[PDB]
RNA sequence: CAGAUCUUGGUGGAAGUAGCAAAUAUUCAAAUGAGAACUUUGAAGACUGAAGUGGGGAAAGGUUCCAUGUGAACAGCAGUU
RNA sequence: GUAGAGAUUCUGACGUGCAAAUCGAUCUUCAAAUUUGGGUAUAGGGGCGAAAGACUAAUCGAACCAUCUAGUAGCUGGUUCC
């Protein structure tokens, strides 16, 4: 007796390590042939977290027309490079890839993806493909026409520009992004003109848009049932430990059931968090990335001393509200929402009033080096 | 003494053996199985790498509880170890077989380890003391090792 | 070489503990031939074996 | 060429940042040996007893954050194809110095 | 003889597994040696802190005492001790 | 309250243990009905017992050793080729 809800959710099983790291899109948004051709996904890198202050526009709320403080996550999103197109035909056994067409020239970043030791390799990855592309230019057109004639789903191959990111990893992340819009012919044509071309973050997503964040969570290693499933700690008198489940099963069935909490892996799992609102899409070529209409100080989106364990964000970035799966510097997937949003919270425009740029390496109290200079005056090493 | 097999030519082979060697029989068997069929020069290189922890001896039969390592990948297994005592005993016996081949005048370029075998020597008994005044065996497992090297 | 016997004899001759016996590390061969208390006394006279001074224990802070 | 003497500064604090108190001084000795091996590419490393005294000067739990070492690659009394690194301690006011060469 | 929780002896799977985690702590160089984490010397860092891990006795043990050599068995790792 | 002498609780550790009764913390007593060495006396239907059927050489509601004795068993197990 004394009923209580079960510990944990059976939908997130098995609690094993994810087989991937990038984070894949399990379902792209439903295609519409009326809206123009556009992308449905993007890749970025989690630079860190900060907090903002903004006026809450929500009639009927207690804090209506009053400032609120909210935590946000910054994801660096430099433009991605489209290097290929993949067509999928709708078979009675699912979606099947028919053929893949690549660009004539591929960068070193994307070419590193096909190798474990690129430096020791002979750098022969698309040499014959480029030769076929330059020989007479009929096979590429034939394959593109095949994708146009057949196939119902078109996905472009795009890779991140990790070179202009402070990450030590030189290998770029490659991903298939489904192309939604009118007609397969326009999708293939759009891919063809975008070969060896960069797609920016603001062309894919816009301000106040609700998106989904897909990524692998922070690794936690092995963990007991107390922290893996949130079970009750056993009394202090418990012999042979107290951080376990007292009863893991009953007689008949003479087996341990799959619904009983057990110790094991507790982290590094694939997740997709829904309904993340875009608070700001900032560019990498302006000095007012973190400046608002109520704070005219020319400052960029970077804490004092740089982002902790990440560096300096000099590219385009997003300011999704709340938290996102995965640790800092992990690659995250941004996907268009599969649902329709009509609530006040979803449709409320966001106008930031202040963005914190103080150091996250401690109890920072200065937003900018100029503010630190004015407050502290002259120091011993400062004057001499 | 009689060797277990003669899978070679008597005029173009060398033999060596060691009896009642105070080394683990199971570890010796794994080393013997790994080095069987390899050339003498490559066997010396492999034994040196095992001693320096660069390569590992896979454990296939006596593998209960043996830890996992990346150095067993080349053998297609996950459980491998570095028995230094067994490697030293095999290294000395291989050197003895090398000297025997030199005395017999064989060509020292085609020397292939043709027949290496490990058998269980009689056990030496010691005593261990347990709870409630109990006395229990603490036996050792010495091994007999024989090596035959011939020409390909 | 082993100098356990020489260390025991040196401590007895010097009327001190073995912790206070010092032997020259550069004269191991000559020290190892002692084998006798008379030879130990000869080593002490030659300066090869000496008695180390007591560890420092001052009462300056106590007096202050 | 092969016989070269250089003065280094080793940041012992970042290498002992998580070591147990009863092992910090022995691990500092091992880190010094690995430091000399990495820099001079010599398997054989001989530590000056004076350097050992300097490492153990403040007990087993308190090793100086930075040490000024003198790595001198020399030839051994064995066959002249084997090189070893002799590590010593250098007494300086402030150990925050760059790597230099000693003639 | 297939049994008797049979008798004596030998030998298995468990298994290279449980385990070899009380008593704060060791490090550098040299010597010997085929071989040194355990031998010896020097140096450093520590502990027992006089109701001691110090110096002696009674009972008990009986050569374990000392010197010179050995490293087959024991010193549940090693051994030049 | 230290040494010494004990063993209340953690029903802690261990529980094929360091140990066939130990280890840690905590706790009782600590100048007398105190603790203890050596010598000596009491021996098995006996001794001894500030009394628990407690102790009497890891053995106690009658110690150990050998013999009667290959004790008896309406009870249990086994009982060998076609």
XYZ file of N, CA, C and O (backbone and C1' of nucleotides) in Angstrom, chain E residues 11-44:
238
model
P 47.468 -35.333 -7.212
O 46.317 -34.964 -8.247
C 46.384 -35.394 -9.597
C 45.047 -35.271 -10.282
C 44.407 -33.894 -10.250
O 44.945 -33.013 -11.220
C 42.795 -35.521 -9.678
P 44.484 -31.476 -11.255
O 43.131 -31.509 -12.092
C 42.172 -30.471 -11.982
C 40.834 -30.911 -12.517
C 39.766 -29.834 -12.602
O 39.889 -29.053 -13.776
C 38.856 -31.795 -11.630
P 40.144 -27.473 -13.678
O 38.695 -26.843 -13.860
C 37.879 -27.186 -14.970
C 36.428 -26.907 -14.678
C 36.147 -25.579 -13.993
O 36.062 -24.503 -14.907
C 35.008 -27.309 -12.858
P 36.857 -23.145 -14.612
O 36.134 -22.556 -13.320
C 34.747 -22.249 -13.342
C 34.181 -22.109 -11.951
C 34.849 -21.079 -11.058
O 34.409 -19.759 -11.320
C 34.550 -23.088 -9.854
P 35.475 -18.567 -11.455
O 36.594 -19.155 -12.425
C 37.447 -18.287 -13.165
C 38.888 -18.733 -13.122
C 39.202 -20.043 -13.844
O 40.520 -19.969 -14.384
C 39.823 -20.231 -11.587
P 40.754 -19.712 -15.951
O 42.176 -18.995 -16.009
C 42.305 -17.591 -15.811
C 42.454 -17.240 -14.350
C 42.987 -15.837 -14.061
O 42.408 -15.368 -12.845
C 44.425 -17.426 -13.100
P 42.284 -13.795 -12.547
O 40.955 -13.680 -11.681
C 39.690 -13.995 -12.242
C 38.766 -14.588 -11.210
C 38.910 -14.029 -9.805
O 38.203 -12.813 -9.634
C 38.817 -16.399 -9.724
P 38.747 -11.684 -8.631
O 38.312 -12.204 -7.191
C 36.945 -12.255 -6.809
C 36.794 -12.793 -5.410
C 37.674 -12.134 -4.357
O 37.121 -10.935 -3.842
C 37.896 -14.473 -4.197
P 37.883 -9.534 -4.046
O 39.262 -9.721 -3.270
C 39.283 -10.039 -1.887
C 40.387 -11.013 -1.559
C 41.778 -10.425 -1.402
O 41.975 -9.864 -0.117
C 41.872 -12.399 -2.717
P 42.780 -8.488 0.061
O 44.307 -8.937 0.099
C 44.807 -9.717 1.174
C 46.223 -10.166 0.918
C 47.206 -9.075 0.520
O 47.707 -8.355 1.633
C 47.443 -10.924 -0.935
P 48.240 -6.849 1.456
O 46.915 -5.991 1.247
C 46.133 -5.584 2.358
C 45.683 -4.151 2.223
C 45.120 -3.517 3.485
O 46.131 -3.040 4.354
C 43.667 -3.084 1.677
P 46.314 -3.686 5.812
O 45.985 -2.488 6.808
C 44.690 -1.908 6.858
C 44.320 -1.533 8.270
C 45.406 -0.817 9.059
O 45.442 0.576 8.806
C 44.564 -2.605 10.344
P 46.804 1.278 8.322
O 47.747 1.214 9.603
C 47.377 1.855 10.814
C 48.271 1.436 11.952
C 49.766 1.539 11.693
O 50.271 2.852 11.858
C 49.284 -0.570 12.624
P 51.552 3.333 11.016
O 51.011 4.555 10.151
C 49.972 4.375 9.194
C 49.891 5.535 8.230
C 51.152 5.790 7.405
O 50.779 6.305 6.128
C 50.657 7.703 8.688
P 51.012 5.435 4.799
O 52.438 5.908 4.272
C 52.972 5.398 3.055
C 54.481 5.376 3.062
C 55.125 4.648 4.240
O 56.316 3.999 3.798
C 55.862 6.893 4.200
P 56.224 2.687 2.876
O 56.294 3.255 1.390
C 57.538 3.580 0.790
C 57.660 5.060 0.529
C 58.821 5.480 -0.358
O 58.549 5.325 -1.740
C 58.793 6.836 1.567
P 59.687 4.769 -2.729
O 60.578 6.050 -3.052
C 60.005 7.200 -3.656
C 60.958 8.368 -3.647
C 62.337 8.116 -4.235
O 62.357 8.162 -5.651
C 62.557 9.254 -2.179
P 63.452 7.320 -6.472
O 64.788 8.171 -6.321
C 64.882 9.483 -6.856
C 66.182 10.145 -6.477
C 67.447 9.374 -6.813
O 67.832 9.495 -8.171
C 67.583 10.163 -4.595
P 68.432 8.228 -8.956
O 69.943 8.143 -8.458
C 70.869 9.169 -8.779
C 72.104 9.105 -7.916
C 72.908 7.817 -7.982
O 73.746 7.748 -9.122
C 72.641 8.467 -5.727
P 74.103 6.326 -9.780
O 75.189 5.706 -8.795
C 76.427 6.363 -8.568
C 77.145 5.795 -7.371
C 77.445 4.305 -7.418
O 78.605 4.004 -8.173
C 76.524 4.862 -5.313
P 78.740 2.593 -8.927
O 78.985 1.549 -7.750
C 80.140 1.630 -6.928
C 80.110 0.592 -5.836
C 79.843 -0.834 -6.289
O 81.008 -1.476 -6.776
C 78.475 -0.326 -4.428
P 80.918 -2.474 -8.031
O 80.348 -3.821 -7.405
C 80.951 -4.405 -6.260
C 80.050 -5.437 -5.635
C 79.424 -6.432 -6.596
O 80.307 -7.484 -6.944
C 77.771 -5.614 -5.116
P 80.561 -7.848 -8.487
O 79.263 -8.671 -8.901
C 78.866 -9.816 -8.163
C 77.383 -10.057 -8.276
C 76.825 -10.115 -9.687
O 77.039 -11.363 -10.323
C 75.463 -8.714 -8.372
P 77.638 -11.412 -11.814
O 76.547 -10.646 -12.685
C 76.707 -10.480 -14.086
C 75.394 -10.650 -14.805
C 74.218 -9.881 -14.221
O 74.170 -8.537 -14.667
C 73.582 -12.124 -14.614
P 73.718 -7.366 -13.666
O 72.198 -7.707 -13.330
C 71.192 -7.641 -14.330
C 69.917 -8.295 -13.863
C 69.310 -7.720 -12.593
O 68.514 -6.574 -12.842
C 69.415 -10.074 -12.417
P 68.885 -5.162 -12.172
O 68.484 -5.346 -10.642
C 67.203 -5.851 -10.283
C 66.663 -5.187 -9.040
C 66.737 -3.660 -9.027
O 65.578 -3.132 -8.384
C 67.915 -4.531 -7.170
P 64.242 -2.862 -9.236
O 63.270 -2.120 -8.215
C 63.710 -0.991 -7.475
C 63.250 -1.062 -6.041
C 63.599 -2.343 -5.300
O 64.914 -2.300 -4.778
C 61.329 -1.754 -4.899
P 65.700 -3.650 -4.416
O 65.234 -3.977 -2.931
C 65.401 -3.026 -1.887
C 64.695 -3.462 -0.629
C 65.258 -4.724 0.018
O 65.132 -4.631 1.435
C 63.000 -5.087 -0.591
P 66.416 -4.264 2.324
O 67.597 -5.094 1.651
C 67.921 -6.403 2.095
C 69.401 -6.661 1.985
C 70.296 -5.502 2.395
O 70.495 -5.441 3.797
C 71.020 -6.361 0.313
P 70.440 -4.033 4.566
O 71.880 -3.404 4.314
C 73.059 -4.108 4.674
C 74.285 -3.445 4.102
C 74.346 -1.934 4.259
O 74.808 -1.531 5.535
C 74.861 -2.511 2.029
P 74.320 -0.138 6.166
O 75.156 0.957 5.368
C 76.575 0.944 5.380
C 77.141 1.967 4.430
C 76.541 3.359 4.527
O 77.065 4.118 5.601
C 76.636 2.713 2.263
P 76.097 5.083 6.444
O 75.981 6.386 5.537
C 77.141 7.119 5.181
C 76.875 8.077 4.049
C 75.671 8.988 4.212
O 75.927 10.097 5.055
C 75.666 8.063 2.041
P 74.771 10.661 6.017
O 73.830 11.487 5.035
C 74.364 12.509 4.209
C 73.372 12.951 3.164
C 71.974 13.263 3.664
O 71.871 14.539 4.268
C 71.830 11.928 1.726
P 70.923 14.749 5.547
O 69.459 14.826 4.927
C 69.153 15.779 3.923
C 67.886 15.433 3.184
C 66.630 15.286 4.024
O 66.065 16.531 4.392
C 66.745 13.530 2.443
